[PDB]
Write a protein that binds this ligand. Structure first.
Ligand SMILES: C[C@@H]1O[C@H](O[C@@H]2[C@H](O)[C@@H](O)[C@H](O)O[C@@H]2C(=O)O)[C@H](O[C@H]2OC(C(=O)O)=C[C@H](O)[C@H]2O)[C@H](O)[C@H]1O
Ligand SMILES: C[C@@H]1O[C@@H](O[C@@H]2[C@H](O)[C@@H](O)[C@@H](O[C@@H]3[C@H](O)[C@@H](O)[C@H](C)O[C@H]3O)O[C@@H]2C(=O)O)[C@H](O)[C@H](O)[C@H]1O
Ligand SMILES: [Ca+2]
Ligand SMILES: [Ca+2]
Length: 425
């Protein structure tokens, strides 16, 4: 019941400790509910000519791994970095460059799956126009899953991209240094760290609800860190950090929208009314940190209703809090109005950077806006913080995947009294 795989392994082997597998394709040929797969640490380079497991959207996508099989309730399938060995499994996909096809590395339709402790790097984009690739894409039917301590970095693909599925828990994952340098002149406008976009086909309790990002970090993603546009059920972002998004990796060169948390929206299309859910979901961002994104930190992103921004810290992220909503009902032309039905509470905002701002575009008559540092009588300053050394945010996680201890953006005990019960620490 416990299978093994290894970069110096063979798919002709039975998949034991002494003689392990070599690819997840063979793994998907055997597994059933309850079984474990220990993925031994090292670099697995996916061959250039490895046939896809499936395709979607009429051959628009090469799907490298179809995570199609399911566990049962209390009996999951578990794909796990081998916990008896140091280091991490790394799937390299630099070589996978199929002709005129988008790439999904993990395409998830199965339920009760548990994926932990490995990396996906080098995911390609070869298409020239409006395109994207994804490391993980999750759709209608993929329920009750867990993705933990998975790192999606140093490629061109979106980290995690949700079009459907229920109660998926994305825990302690990192999505960084991702940038599409090939398509549309290298804008990188489609490459987010984390993307919650539960489509019209996947609504209903048990079908699109209860998806949560938690403990995740998103940095140097060319577009946004986290994005919940075109999201029909409520997604929650808890205890996450989004920083240095909107830039080409390792620089302050302009790429995409550079939002830390784009926590709603259905677009401001001038030509047509966008499709929307009948109940506008109250998304939540909570106990989360935004720092030095290109343009904005915590952003309602033209949402058609309420959002919770509770107990977040925001530092030098352009517009740190922006609550801009689209007017209701849907109307052309698309007109922006002061944010309505929001819960904005217990947040902290440091602005020392040229052009940045504490809050914009909220209606205090129509939203609950209480106990935020930017509304207090005393302005927040650099001395109030124990550290502001940004390299501490890129510290390697604890051995069990939890976010590392950081002094960054944490108040001093003196400052904690003058800003009490404010911020994500
Ligand atoms: C309607 C609104 O447009 C967004 O961005 C615009 C503009 O493109 C950007 O360069 C400027 O700095 O900010 C503007 C703004 O109103 O915020 C952005 O949409 C773009 O990216 C995404 C996305 O990341 O999901 C979706 C759209 O297809 C694309 O045009 C924003 O999310 C959107 O609500
Ligand atoms: C194959 C196409 O898939 C669909 O379109 C999706 C999406 O529904 C559109 O809103 C748009 O989304 C863009 C970016 O692609 C996305 O990364 C970002 C989160 O939001 C918008 O910026 O295009 C998408 C796409 O994959 O092209 C629809 O099913 C289309 O009908 C279909 O052509
Ligand atoms: Ca964009
Ligand atoms: Ca985005």
């Amino acid at each position: 019941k416990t299978y093994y795989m290894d970069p110096e392994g063979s798919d002709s082997n039975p998949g034991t400790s002494d003689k392990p597998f070599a690819t997840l394709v063979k793994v998907q040929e055997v597994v059933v509910a309850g079984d474990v797969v220990y993925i031994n640490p090292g670099t697995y380079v996916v061959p250039a000519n490895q046939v896809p497991m499936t395709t979607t959207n009429s051959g628009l996508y090469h799907c490298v791994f179809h995570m199609n099989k399911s566990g049962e309730a209390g009996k999951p399938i578990s794909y796990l970095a081998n916990p008896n060995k140091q280091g991490r499994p790394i799937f390299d996909l630099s070589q996978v460059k199929p002709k005129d096809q988008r790439i999904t590395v993990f395409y998830v339709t199965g339920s009760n799956l548990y994926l932990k402790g490995f990396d996906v790097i080098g995911t390609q984009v070869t298409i020239t126009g409006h395109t994207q690739s994804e490391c993980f894409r999750i759709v209608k039917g993929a329920n009750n899953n867990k993705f933990e301590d998975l790192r999606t970095h140093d490629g061109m693909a979106i980290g995690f991209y949700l079009l459907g599925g229920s109660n998926n828990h994305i825990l302690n994952c990192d999505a960084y240094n991702n940038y599409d340098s090939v398509s549309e002149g290298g804008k990188g406008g489609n490459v987010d760290g984390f993307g919650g976009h539960i489509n019209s086909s996947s609504v209903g309790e048990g079908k699109g609800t209860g998806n949560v990002f938690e403990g995740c970090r998103a940095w140097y993603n060319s577009d946004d860190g986290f994005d919940l546009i075109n999201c029909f059920e409520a997604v929650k972002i808890i205890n996450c950090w989004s920083f240095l998004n909107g830039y080409k990796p390792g620089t302050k060169e302009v790429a995409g929208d550079g939002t830390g948390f784009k926590a709603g929206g259905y677009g401001m299309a001038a030509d047509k009314l966008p499709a929307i859910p009948s109940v506008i979901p109250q998304h939540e961002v909570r106990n989360s940190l935004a720092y030095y994104n290109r343009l904005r930190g915590f952003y309602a992103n033209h949402h058609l209703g309420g959002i919770i921004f509770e107990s977040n810290t925001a530092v030098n992220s352009g517009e740190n809090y922006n609550m801009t909503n689209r007017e209701s009902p849907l109307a052309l032309p698309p007109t922006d109005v002061n944010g309505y039905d929001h819960m904005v509470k217990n947040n902290l905002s440091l602005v020392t950077r040229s052009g940045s701002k504490h809050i914009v575009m909220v209606n205090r008559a129509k939203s609950e806006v209480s106990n935020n540092s930017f509304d207090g009588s005393e302005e927040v300053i650099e001395t109030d913080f124990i550290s502001l050394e940004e390299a501490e945010l890129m510290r390697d996680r604890k051995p069990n995947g939890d976010l590392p201890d950081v002094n960054f953006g944490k108040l001093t005990t003196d400052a904690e009294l003058r800003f009490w019960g404010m911020g994500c620490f």
